[PDB]
Symmetry: C2
Subunit: 104 residues, 2 copies
């Protein structure tokens, strides 16, 4: 994929969900038209998704130290990747996956 | 230990080595005095030491990122922890062992 990712021919199947419509009271005399009056309704719940991953361990004889992703050592008004005073979560910067090195 | 380390009651036994003295030619007439003239001599070789270590894996539910030891990302005249032009190895800074966190 050009955005980056894992191109799949059979990707994870998309999951669709809907509230089953519940009609408001129909008239007492039959009518051909479909029922246009419904009960205002919504649902809530809990969803869980668990992905197993396969890792390729880094095996390298490089002598000197790598470059690692490290949080800022210096003080700050609030922790990065954590809530602020108002409870708003925030992610301060995009984090790529390439800090290790290999030989080309 | 106050310098830091692993205090041992039976530490690794210190290994001692010496060149066995080889005398220069003694006189042809017996003498009681010990032999004061030796052959100038030295030895060389290869030594190997292999230590097995026991690690305590870090298991933590901290949400935000840790602080890691990372080499300087910015350019420099030469790599740190690597030889210079003249072949002189150098270690630019002392590196302590505590970058991870726990709850007190």
């Amino acid at each position: 994929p050009l955005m980056g990712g894992f191109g799949l021919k059979h990707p994870p199947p998309q999951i669709l969900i809907k509230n089953t419509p519940v009609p408001a009271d129909p008239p007492t005399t039959f009518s051909q038209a479909k029922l246009a009056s419904f009960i205002t309704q919504y649902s809530t719940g809990q969803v869980s998704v668990e992905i197993e991953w396969e890792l390729q361990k880094e095996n390298s004889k490089r002598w000197n130290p790598e470059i690692q992703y490290t949080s800022n050592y210096y003080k700050s008004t609030n922790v990065d990747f954590a809530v602020n005073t108002d409870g708003t979560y925030s992610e301060p910067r995009p984090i790529g996956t390439r800090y290790l090195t290999r030989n080309l």
